[PDB]
Amino acid sequence: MKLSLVISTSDAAFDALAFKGDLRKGMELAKRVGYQAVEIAVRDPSIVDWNEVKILSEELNLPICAIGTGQAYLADGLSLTHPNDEIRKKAIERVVKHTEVAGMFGALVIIGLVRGRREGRSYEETEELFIESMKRLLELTEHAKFVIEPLNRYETDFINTIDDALRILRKINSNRVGILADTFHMNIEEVNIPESLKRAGEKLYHFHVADSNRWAPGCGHFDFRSVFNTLKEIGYNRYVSVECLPLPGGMEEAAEIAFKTLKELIIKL
Amino acid sequence: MKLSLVISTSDAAFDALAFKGDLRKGMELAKRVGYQAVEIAVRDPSIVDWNEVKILSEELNLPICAIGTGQAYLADGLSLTHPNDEIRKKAIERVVKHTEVAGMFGALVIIGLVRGRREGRSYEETEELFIESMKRLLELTEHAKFVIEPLNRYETDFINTIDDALRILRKINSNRVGILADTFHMNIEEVNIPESLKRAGEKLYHFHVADSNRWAPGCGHFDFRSVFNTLKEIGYNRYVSVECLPLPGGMEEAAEIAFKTLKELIIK
Ligand SMILES: [Cu+2]
Ligand SMILES: [Cu+2]
C-alpha cells in the first residue's frame, strides 16, 4: 500500500496563478510530510498547462495517482446521466479531456458526482443511462482507467454503496473500471465496512480516507484498524489517498496528522 | 478491436430503391459472415430516409461505424480546398449533412478525397485552406468526429502520409479530428508501417484493410501480421473495416475471405 494526499486547487479559469500556486504548495507539502503521490481535482482540464504540471511532478518525484472530475457537475452542471442528451454528450466530452490528462500521469479518472443524480427518475433508467455513458467512454479511450466512487445519500441518490457499484461493474464488464471506496461515505452508507470491502475484493482500485467528521484520519471515531486489517486480507496494494477537510488546524496540520495515523496502521500490518 | 465491412450502395438520388436494396443486402451479408458493424459511403445524404436505415440497423443488431464522403468529390466536384469559395462553401455544407447522418449512428465521418487536391497551388496554400474548412466544420457541428485518410500519390497530392496527417492535426488542435490509415495506401506511401502506426498512436481513430492489390486481405502479399501485432501493442480497440475490391470471386466471397483472414489474426 502507498499513501497519497488530495490537494485542493483553485479553478484555473479564473486565476491561473492561484491554481499553479495552490498546486505547488500542495505538492511541496505532500513531499515534506512523506506522501508517495498526490491526487488532484479539476473542473475543466482544457484551461490548464499540463506540461508545466508534469515538470513539477518530475521535479518533486511525486506522481499524480488520480484525477477528480466532480466540479464538472457542481460548477458546470455536466452529468453522464443528464436527461438532456446534449448535456450527456458534453459530459462525456469533458471526461475524455480528463482522460487525456490522466494519460500523461498514468492516473486513475474518478467518476464521482459527474455521474449525476436520479432527478425524479427510476434507479433503473438512471443506471441504464450511466452504463451507456461508461461504455461510450471505454470505446473512446484506449488506456484510461476509471473508478466509480459510491457517495452518501446527501450528495447523490445514485450509487450510494459498494454493492451498487459492484452491480454496475458486472454490467459494464471491463477491467478498466473499478471502485473507489471512501471511509467518510462508507461510515454512513455501509452496514459492515470490512464485509463490503471483501465483496469488492480485486475491484477495489483506489481508496479515500477521512474520519467520521471528514477531518484528518485520527480526529473522529472511525474504526480504521478494522479497515486496514481487511485491506491486508484482500491484498490491497494500491493507493490510500487522504481526502479530508483541512481540520484540525489547517491544510498542513491535517495532512501531517493523517499521515501519522495511516503510517501507524500500515506498518503494524 | 472490432471488424466492420464497407458495403457499396447505388446513389439514391438516381435510384432510391436500389440504394435500399444494396444496403439491405450488404448489411445482411455482413451479419451473416460475422462482421460487428458496417461502413457506408454516400454522395449526398439529404436524399435518403435515414430513419428507415436506423430501423434496419437496429433490427440486425449491426451498427454503422463510419460514413464515407468521397463521391461528393468524384461525382459532384465538391472539395474542402476548392479555389472557388462558393463551391468550397457547398462542400462544407454537404459534409455537415454527412455529420447529421453520422450523428444518428454514433459514426465517424471520413475526410478522404473530399479534401481535394493542390490543383497547381503550393502545398502550404492548399493546407491552410483545408485547415480553415475543418475549423469551419468543427464550428458548424457540435459532436461530429472526423477522420483524415492519407491517400496514395495517384489519388491525390495533398496528405499522402500518416506523418503529414499528424502535422496537420496538430494545427487543427481538436480531438474531434483523427486519422484513418488504409493498408493498400500505406503499402505505397509509408516507409515502415508499424513505425508509422506507432507514431499515430491514439490519433489513429479508424482503420481500412485491403491487400497489396486491394483484393480481400490474404489475397496479395501485404504483411497483416505485423500490422495487427502493432495494433495490439498500442491498445487499438476501435474498428478495422474491410474496404477492398470485390475480388476474388465477387463481393460476398471477398467479404468471407477477408473476415477469415482478419479474425484469425485478431484472435491470435
Ligand atoms: Cu472521496
Ligand atoms: Cu480506405
XYZ file of C-alpha atoms and ligand atoms in Angstrom:
539
model
C 0.000 0.000 0.000
C 1.069 3.550 -0.748
C -0.059 6.895 0.701
C -1.337 9.825 -1.373
C -2.621 13.310 -0.488
C -5.534 15.026 -2.228
C -4.605 18.647 -2.940
C -7.290 21.323 -3.283
C -6.683 23.762 -6.123
C -8.347 26.953 -7.320
C -10.004 26.759 -10.715
C -7.536 27.984 -13.334
C -10.165 29.811 -15.374
C -10.359 32.450 -13.244
C -6.945 32.660 -11.650
C -4.241 30.666 -13.388
C -1.675 31.900 -10.876
C -3.756 30.646 -7.951
C -4.079 27.183 -9.499
C -0.319 26.951 -10.056
C 0.382 28.358 -6.614
C -2.060 26.008 -4.892
C -0.683 23.034 -6.770
C 2.956 23.711 -5.926
C 2.178 24.438 -2.257
C 0.144 21.260 -2.001
C 2.705 19.086 -3.756
C 5.566 20.524 -1.678
C 3.507 19.811 1.452
C 2.845 16.226 0.415
C 6.506 15.579 -0.281
C 7.674 17.082 3.029
C 5.193 15.061 5.051
C 6.143 11.839 3.251
C 3.321 11.101 0.825
C 4.323 8.998 -2.201
C 1.882 10.613 -4.653
C -0.787 13.316 -4.939
C -4.344 13.367 -6.185
C -5.872 16.420 -7.830
C -9.300 17.585 -8.955
C -10.003 19.870 -11.903
C -13.216 21.172 -13.426
C -12.037 21.587 -16.999
C -8.544 20.447 -17.934
C -8.574 22.479 -21.163
C -7.581 25.664 -19.296
C -4.501 24.228 -17.531
C -0.925 23.940 -18.808
C -0.312 20.258 -18.036
C 3.199 20.337 -19.467
C 4.100 22.561 -16.538
C 2.327 20.247 -14.098
C 4.328 17.286 -15.438
C 7.568 19.229 -14.929
C 6.554 19.932 -11.323
C 5.730 16.261 -10.743
C 9.150 15.333 -12.101
C 10.985 17.963 -10.024
C 9.405 16.698 -6.801
C 9.413 12.973 -7.639
C 5.712 12.948 -6.930
C 3.343 11.065 -9.283
C -0.286 12.077 -9.723
C -2.214 8.909 -8.945
C -5.801 10.068 -9.569
C -7.812 12.936 -11.061
C -11.215 14.020 -9.690
C -13.956 15.307 -12.029
C -16.718 16.377 -9.621
C -16.594 20.122 -10.318
C -17.679 19.393 -13.897
C -21.014 18.562 -12.287
C -21.066 21.029 -9.388
C -19.898 24.043 -11.364
C -20.788 23.258 -14.960
C -23.836 21.040 -14.450
C -22.421 18.263 -16.591
C -23.784 14.804 -15.871
C -23.216 11.425 -17.529
C -26.896 10.609 -16.863
C -28.390 14.040 -17.653
C -31.913 13.744 -19.066
C -30.834 16.167 -21.818
C -28.773 14.030 -24.201
C -26.912 17.150 -25.361
C -25.549 17.641 -21.850
C -24.828 13.916 -21.543
C -22.689 14.259 -24.691
C -20.914 17.313 -23.291
C -20.256 15.413 -20.059
C -18.691 12.522 -21.958
C -16.591 15.047 -23.921
C -15.410 16.723 -20.711
C -14.428 13.427 -19.107
C -12.498 12.446 -22.257
C -10.408 15.587 -21.625
C -9.752 14.349 -18.099
C -8.579 11.017 -19.552
C -6.141 12.863 -21.844
C -4.530 14.436 -18.781
C -4.687 11.137 -16.844
C -2.737 9.524 -19.672
C 0.170 11.916 -19.095
C 0.496 10.768 -15.497
C -0.753 7.207 -15.521
C -3.560 8.444 -13.259
C -6.964 6.984 -12.478
C -10.020 9.022 -13.524
C -12.587 9.337 -10.719
C -16.266 9.032 -11.576
C -17.939 10.744 -8.614
C -20.707 13.358 -8.828
C -20.103 13.729 -12.578
C -22.331 10.635 -12.942
C -25.349 12.767 -11.958
C -28.464 12.069 -9.882
C -31.795 10.279 -10.463
C -33.591 13.623 -10.905
C -37.048 12.159 -10.269
C -36.432 9.088 -12.446
C -36.291 5.376 -11.655
C -32.998 3.990 -10.374
C -33.222 1.601 -13.335
C -33.253 4.300 -16.006
C -30.520 6.277 -14.302
C -28.388 3.131 -14.142
C -29.020 2.283 -17.800
C -28.013 5.763 -18.914
C -24.892 5.605 -16.768
C -23.800 2.233 -18.118
C -24.286 3.549 -21.654
C -22.102 6.591 -20.946
C -19.358 4.484 -19.335
C -19.394 2.109 -22.278
C -19.031 5.129 -24.592
C -16.074 6.356 -22.515
C -14.424 2.928 -22.822
C -14.992 2.973 -26.574
C -13.476 6.469 -26.717
C -10.319 5.675 -24.735
C -7.564 3.098 -25.234
C -5.684 3.355 -21.937
C -7.841 5.266 -19.410
C -8.865 3.544 -16.181
C -11.905 4.736 -14.248
C -13.027 4.344 -10.656
C -16.639 4.683 -9.543
C -16.995 6.240 -6.085
C -20.118 5.498 -4.062
C -21.212 8.631 -2.215
C -23.588 9.217 0.679
C -27.313 9.983 0.379
C -26.926 13.724 0.829
C -24.561 14.098 -2.138
C -26.474 11.798 -4.508
C -29.274 9.235 -4.825
C -27.379 7.225 -7.442
C -24.729 4.670 -6.332
C -24.644 5.032 -2.551
C -22.990 1.695 -1.684
C -20.141 -0.557 -2.765
C -22.829 -3.126 -3.758
C -24.498 -0.517 -6.003
C -21.147 -0.085 -7.727
C -20.330 -3.792 -7.983
C -23.660 -4.422 -9.737
C -22.804 -1.765 -12.285
C -19.277 -3.106 -12.770
C -20.693 -6.512 -13.648
C -22.871 -4.934 -16.336
C -20.020 -2.848 -17.784
C -17.770 -5.920 -17.753
C -14.414 -4.128 -18.196
C -11.294 -4.349 -16.061
C -10.718 -0.678 -16.899
C -13.457 0.301 -14.453
C -13.159 -0.342 -10.727
C -14.293 1.013 -7.370
C -13.109 3.931 -5.244
C -14.301 3.417 -1.668
C -14.284 6.361 0.768
C -14.366 5.836 4.542
C -16.345 9.033 5.282
C -19.073 7.963 2.844
C -18.948 4.303 3.940
C -19.362 5.384 7.574
C -22.865 6.486 6.624
C -23.917 4.061 3.879
C -22.269 0.682 4.545
C -23.686 -1.791 7.045
C -20.457 -3.692 7.706
C -17.457 -1.996 6.147
C -14.975 -4.910 6.334
C -17.567 -7.172 4.650
C -18.222 -4.516 1.999
C -14.521 -4.317 1.165
C -14.199 -8.113 0.976
C -17.089 -8.155 -1.513
C -15.241 -5.550 -3.596
C -12.012 -7.527 -3.428
C -9.994 -7.210 -6.633
C -12.364 -4.482 -7.881
C -11.122 -2.022 -5.249
C -8.771 0.125 -7.349
C -8.417 3.251 -5.191
C -9.175 4.255 -1.594
C -10.116 7.575 0.081
C -9.635 8.129 3.794
C -11.104 10.752 6.105
C -12.512 10.321 9.562
C -16.202 10.185 10.554
C -16.398 14.017 10.620
C -14.327 14.131 7.390
C -11.406 15.521 9.407
C -7.895 14.078 9.246
C -7.895 10.345 9.990
C -7.394 10.064 13.732
C -9.612 13.023 14.609
C -13.045 11.404 14.607
C -14.240 7.954 15.715
C -13.996 5.868 12.556
C -12.512 2.386 13.029
C -9.575 2.452 10.625
C -7.957 -0.539 12.329
C -10.589 -2.987 11.082
C -10.472 -1.440 7.609
C -6.718 -1.792 7.280
C -6.793 -5.381 8.541
C -9.283 -6.100 5.768
C -7.234 -4.255 3.146
C -4.332 -6.519 4.090
C -6.605 -9.590 3.882
C -7.765 -8.800 0.335
C -4.221 -7.967 -0.758
C -4.874 -4.299 -1.485
C -1.607 -2.809 -2.697
C -2.545 0.448 -4.408
C -3.090 3.978 -3.086
C -4.651 5.143 0.119
C -5.455 8.763 -0.544
C -6.203 11.379 2.122
C -9.278 13.390 1.153
C -10.274 15.388 4.188
C -11.293 18.803 5.388
C -8.328 20.985 6.394
C -9.095 20.195 10.034
C -7.924 20.320 12.653
C -5.648 23.339 12.309
C -5.487 23.857 8.561
C -4.323 22.051 5.447
C -0.755 21.382 6.634
C -1.624 20.131 10.093
C -4.393 17.917 8.741
C -2.093 16.317 6.162
C 0.563 15.624 8.820
C -1.910 14.165 11.336
C -3.427 11.998 8.595
C -0.031 10.689 7.517
C 0.939 9.737 11.066
C -2.346 7.920 11.707
C -2.192 5.935 8.455
C 1.502 5.102 8.687
C 0.979 3.509 12.104
C -1.962 1.456 10.800
C 0.025 0.285 7.769
C 3.385 -0.503 9.353
C 1.765 -2.615 12.040
C 0.289 -4.706 9.259
C -10.710 -4.223 -31.803
C -13.795 -4.805 -33.949
C -14.385 -5.904 -37.543
C -16.527 -3.980 -39.992
C -17.374 -4.296 -43.674
C -17.611 -1.461 -46.181
C -20.655 -2.053 -48.330
C -21.230 -0.415 -51.700
C -24.563 1.217 -52.444
C -26.117 2.814 -55.510
C -26.718 6.562 -55.461
C -30.217 7.109 -54.041
C -30.864 10.348 -55.927
C -30.707 8.225 -59.076
C -32.451 5.106 -57.725
C -33.628 5.175 -54.106
C -34.973 1.641 -54.334
C -31.576 0.333 -55.453
C -29.842 2.116 -52.573
C -32.149 0.460 -50.045
C -31.738 -2.867 -51.817
C -27.939 -2.648 -51.910
C -27.850 -1.541 -48.294
C -30.065 -4.364 -47.029
C -28.137 -6.981 -48.995
C -24.811 -5.581 -47.805
C -25.882 -5.456 -44.184
C -27.350 -8.955 -44.296
C -24.057 -10.183 -45.807
C -22.034 -8.525 -43.057
C -24.151 -10.030 -40.278
C -24.093 -13.487 -41.860
C -20.312 -13.525 -42.239
C -19.886 -12.211 -38.699
C -18.896 -8.557 -39.013
C -19.721 -6.399 -35.971
C -20.584 -3.245 -37.928
C -20.805 -1.804 -41.413
C -19.395 1.269 -43.062
C -21.174 3.004 -45.902
C -20.471 5.745 -48.410
C -22.951 8.233 -49.851
C -22.560 11.116 -52.285
C -25.459 13.164 -50.925
C -27.131 12.090 -47.655
C -30.055 14.528 -47.784
C -31.713 12.276 -50.375
C -32.084 9.175 -48.163
C -34.551 8.115 -45.436
C -32.050 7.565 -42.654
C -34.824 6.773 -40.191
C -35.517 3.574 -42.097
C -31.793 2.758 -42.146
C -31.667 3.075 -38.350
C -34.515 0.576 -38.053
C -32.659 -1.846 -40.310
C -29.505 -1.397 -38.231
C -31.485 -1.933 -35.044
C -33.286 -4.985 -36.428
C -29.980 -6.586 -37.438
C -28.090 -5.506 -34.323
C -25.492 -4.047 -36.661
C -24.076 -0.551 -36.027
C -22.820 1.810 -38.725
C -19.322 2.825 -37.662
C -18.329 5.286 -40.399
C -19.740 7.313 -43.305
C -17.675 7.857 -46.463
C -17.878 11.120 -48.410
C -15.575 10.673 -51.400
C -18.300 10.583 -54.043
C -19.138 14.196 -53.143
C -15.796 14.956 -54.798
C -15.634 12.352 -57.554
C -19.213 12.924 -58.733
C -20.108 16.484 -57.681
C -16.702 18.204 -57.702
C -17.127 19.370 -54.109
C -13.786 19.975 -52.375
C -12.884 21.368 -48.949
C -9.927 23.085 -50.671
C -11.738 24.216 -53.827
C -10.256 27.517 -55.032
C -13.806 28.727 -55.700
C -15.095 29.854 -52.305
C -18.736 29.278 -53.285
C -18.036 25.654 -54.186
C -15.888 25.243 -51.085
C -18.841 26.501 -49.044
C -21.122 23.959 -50.719
C -18.575 21.238 -49.938
C -18.601 22.223 -46.256
C -22.404 22.261 -46.219
C -22.522 18.794 -47.828
C -20.177 17.351 -45.208
C -22.263 18.976 -42.450
C -25.199 16.906 -43.748
C -22.976 13.798 -43.645
C -22.311 14.591 -39.957
C -26.044 14.776 -39.240
C -26.396 11.268 -40.600
C -23.313 10.080 -38.732
C -24.718 11.580 -35.528
C -27.735 9.259 -35.712
C -25.415 6.261 -35.650
C -22.547 7.477 -33.495
C -20.417 7.104 -36.608
C -17.203 8.734 -37.831
C -17.138 10.956 -40.908
C -14.347 10.147 -43.345
C -12.391 13.010 -44.902
C -10.812 11.305 -47.904
C -10.931 12.618 -51.470
C -13.435 15.306 -50.436
C -10.487 17.341 -49.137
C -9.425 17.991 -52.724
C -6.061 18.349 -54.460
C -3.407 21.073 -54.847
C -4.616 21.966 -58.369
C -1.450 23.895 -59.225
C -1.161 25.676 -55.877
C 1.542 25.375 -53.239
C 1.174 22.684 -50.589
C 1.030 25.436 -47.996
C -1.868 27.321 -49.599
C -3.815 24.072 -50.029
C -3.115 23.109 -46.415
C -4.239 26.418 -44.869
C -7.445 26.292 -46.907
C -8.043 22.774 -45.652
C -7.417 23.796 -42.055
C -9.869 26.684 -42.455
C -12.573 24.362 -43.816
C -12.003 21.837 -40.999
C -12.227 24.537 -38.343
C -15.431 25.739 -40.020
C -16.792 22.195 -39.876
C -15.925 21.977 -36.182
C -17.818 25.253 -35.610
C -20.887 24.155 -37.571
C -21.172 20.744 -35.955
C -21.031 20.098 -32.216
C -20.217 16.434 -31.633
C -19.211 15.123 -35.074
C -15.888 13.297 -35.338
C -13.797 13.349 -38.498
C -11.025 11.063 -39.705
C -8.489 12.217 -42.285
C -7.346 9.426 -44.618
C -3.901 9.719 -46.222
C -4.160 8.511 -49.823
C -1.510 7.477 -52.312
C 0.123 9.815 -54.852
C -2.072 8.712 -57.748
C -5.270 9.672 -55.925
C -4.069 12.977 -54.517
C -1.083 15.253 -53.999
C -2.439 16.514 -50.682
C -1.843 14.434 -47.488
C -0.127 11.270 -48.715
C 1.291 10.026 -45.396
C 0.375 9.467 -41.764
C 3.123 11.896 -40.732
C 1.696 14.617 -42.941
C -1.731 13.996 -41.454
C -0.271 14.200 -37.918
C 1.339 17.540 -38.730
C -1.987 18.897 -39.942
C -3.856 17.522 -36.899
C -1.565 19.486 -34.602
C -2.517 22.666 -36.458
C -6.263 21.926 -36.213
C -5.840 21.121 -32.491
C -9.061 19.218 -31.848
C -9.605 15.690 -30.583
C -12.652 15.647 -32.859
C -10.277 15.043 -35.770
C -8.061 11.980 -36.097
C -6.509 9.641 -38.662
C -7.834 6.842 -40.827
C -4.988 4.653 -42.143
C -5.528 2.300 -45.085
C -3.188 -0.656 -45.685
C -3.406 -0.530 -49.517
C -2.438 3.147 -49.451
C 0.205 2.649 -46.735
C 1.754 -0.141 -48.793
C 2.783 2.522 -51.314
C 3.356 5.623 -49.172
C 4.660 4.541 -45.726
C 8.326 3.676 -45.227
C 7.757 1.398 -42.216
C 4.117 0.724 -41.479
C 4.437 -0.443 -37.882
C 6.566 2.617 -37.057
C 4.013 4.860 -38.783
C 1.178 3.322 -36.783
C 3.069 3.775 -33.519
C 3.629 7.448 -34.303
C -0.101 7.830 -34.959
C -0.840 6.106 -31.661
C -4.078 7.278 -30.028
C -4.707 9.561 -33.009
C -5.383 6.526 -35.160
C -9.184 6.639 -34.988
C -10.201 4.213 -37.741
C -8.530 1.609 -39.958
C -9.137 0.324 -43.508
C -7.838 -3.025 -44.728
C -7.278 -4.351 -48.237
C -4.331 -6.336 -49.554
C -1.443 -5.021 -51.680
C -3.541 -5.447 -54.862
C -6.562 -4.057 -52.966
C -8.180 -7.509 -53.038
C -9.513 -9.203 -49.907
C -6.876 -9.387 -47.159
C -4.977 -12.647 -47.673
C -5.055 -12.481 -51.465
C -1.974 -10.322 -52.050
C 1.382 -10.052 -50.238
C 0.766 -7.396 -47.580
C 2.095 -8.229 -44.078
C -1.076 -8.006 -41.970
C 0.574 -9.978 -39.176
C 2.992 -7.168 -38.288
C 0.194 -4.611 -38.594
C -2.058 -6.439 -36.134
C 0.827 -7.090 -33.762
C 1.369 -3.324 -33.681
C -2.347 -2.538 -33.297
C -2.467 -4.839 -30.268
C 0.676 -3.271 -28.787
C -0.765 0.257 -28.978
C -4.058 -0.927 -27.492
C -6.185 -0.284 -30.567
C -9.783 -1.005 -29.598
C -11.601 0.706 -32.471
C -12.743 -0.581 -35.885
C -10.910 -2.465 -38.594
C -13.023 -2.012 -41.705
C -12.704 -4.116 -44.863
C -12.560 -1.794 -47.882
C -11.460 -3.836 -50.856
C -12.239 -4.667 -54.452
C -14.876 -7.389 -54.829
C -12.053 -9.836 -55.587
C -11.502 -12.613 -55.781
C -14.845 -14.005 -56.894
C -17.255 -11.207 -56.009
C -18.406 -9.057 -53.105
C -19.623 -11.951 -50.945
C -16.564 -14.143 -51.476
C -14.255 -11.195 -50.860
C -16.071 -10.376 -47.615
C -15.843 -14.021 -46.499
C -12.132 -14.334 -47.279
C -11.264 -11.011 -45.621
C -13.157 -11.951 -42.457
C -11.477 -15.360 -42.244
C -8.044 -13.786 -42.667
C -8.598 -10.996 -40.157
C -10.491 -12.953 -37.478
C -7.528 -15.334 -37.353
C -5.001 -12.522 -36.825
C -7.212 -10.894 -34.207
C -7.831 -13.984 -32.051
C -4.143 -14.904 -32.161
Cu -13.727 10.693 -1.646
Cu -9.568 3.354 -47.485
